[PDB]
């Protein structure tokens, strides 16, 4: 719906602790 | 202490990500 939206990745800060 | 406080549940986004 938003006009002009681009594609990018939003990294989750919980992942580094979840993996380790 | 708070006058008029009602009872409800608060969803925790941490628990489902941590469990999975």
From Swiss-Prot, chains A, B:
Which protein is depicted? Spike protein S2'
The protein's superkingdom reads Viruses
Residues glycosylated per entry: 7
Q: What does this protein do?
A: Subunit of the fusion protein that is processed upon entry into the host cell. Mediates fusion of the virion and cellular membranes by functioning as a class I viral fusion protein. Contains a viral fusion peptide that is unmasked after S2 cleavage. This cleavage can occur at the cell membrane by host TMPRSS2 or during endocytosis by host CSTL. In either case, this triggers an extensive and irreversible conformational change that leads to fusion of the viral envelope with the cellular cytoplasmic membrane, releasing viral genomic RNA into the host cell cytoplasm.
Q: Which organism is it from?
A: Severe acute respiratory syndrome coronavirus 2
- Which lineage is the organism of this entry classified under, starting from the top rank? Viruses, Riboviria, Orthornavirae, Pisuviricota, Pisoniviricetes
